[PDB]
Amino acid sequence: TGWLAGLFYQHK
């Protein structure tokens, strides 16, 4: 979750 995960992919 979080911004960490948003580095690898940003959710639909």
Partner: antibody, heavy 101, light 105 residues
Amino acid sequence: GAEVKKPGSSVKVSCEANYVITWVRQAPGQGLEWMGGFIPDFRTAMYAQGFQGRVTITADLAYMELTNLRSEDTAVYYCARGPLSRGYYDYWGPGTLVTVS
Amino acid sequence: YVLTQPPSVSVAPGQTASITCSGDKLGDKYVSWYQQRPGQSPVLVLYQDSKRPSGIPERFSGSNSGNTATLTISGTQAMDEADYYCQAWDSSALVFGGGTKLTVL
């Protein structure tokens, strides 16, 4: 581009370290399987599931190291690169065949 | 998280091929597609369900709904022979479909 490792040995696959680095392997007859990822600007490494904890992701070049090789680890290993925050990889490096026996 | 694809599709030159990729509420995720010609590194042919990188012709197109994403290739050429893999992210894990082997003959 093709290497032969003995059982129980180790292999390191290195990749050039705004982009996301990902390591993928293609085992004969098993499609592609993620091994983990690395984001150079944030130094964040994600680990994939299913390698019994024998993957290490490090950077000085970033490196994916797989220890305690067995015949099931025979596969083509790729570096791949993609844009930050976009979950896809638009550049795949040349594969490296690793033959364990 | 599991993504399933048909293992093989076999089509004559010129006709349209569809390759499906299914997973639990996959329609709610961005799906990317890769073309791997035999003996070669994969190439990105679709991202974000339906967008084509530069160099990928408009005869490649994609859709994504319910539990299935679909890659559609019209006017199939011999050079389209390849393994096609869908990918998606679930819970900070990257997942690949099992790949579909496309034969043009």
